[PDB]
């Protein structure tokens, strides 16, 4: 696919991986090497997206104006919703981080099993906003 599209990919791999939740991923989190990580790749991920957005107005089929200036504005939104998704995972892993060093040596395994729940809902949301933008994406230069 696209370069933003392999980003989110690399985006997505990763955050597989911190959602296993095993004892590597729990020496990364506490280290807060997942959370600059994810930061890395959704700074690439937004750059990318702009960067295609861009390309794309340079082969658009001539509609409306009005059509053409509502689309950019949807797309930006679109764009905006897939950089705060990104964001809000980076922010509950952060939380974690916090919950974990304020316990001392306490089982972590309930605060796990919360973890693991709310990331599963967190990217339920950012599969759904970044299939969105893909369709508006594809939708953009045909007008």
Not at 59 to 67: C, F, G, I, K
Not at 78 to 86: E, F, K, S, W
Not at 126 to 141: N, P
């Amino acid at each position: 696919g696209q370069r933003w599209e392999l980003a989110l990919g690399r985006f997505w791999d990763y955050l597989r991986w911190v959602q296993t939740l095993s004892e590597q991923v729990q020496e990364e989190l506490l280290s807060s090497q997942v959370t600059q990580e994810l930061r890395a790749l959704m700074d690439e991920t937004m750059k990318e997206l702009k960067a295609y957005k861009s390309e794309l107005e340079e082969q658009l089929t001539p509609v409306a104006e009005e059509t053409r200036a509502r689309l950019s504005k949807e797309l930006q939104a679109a764009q905006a919703r897939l950089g705060a998704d990104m964001e809000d995972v980076r922010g509950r892993l952060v939380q974690y981080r916090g919950e974990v060093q304020a316990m001392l040596g306490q089982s972590t395994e309930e605060l796990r099993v919360r973890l693991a729940s709310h990331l599963r809902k967190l990217r339920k949301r950012l599969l759904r906003d970044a299939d969105d933008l893909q369709k508006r994406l594809a939708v953009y230069q045909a007008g």
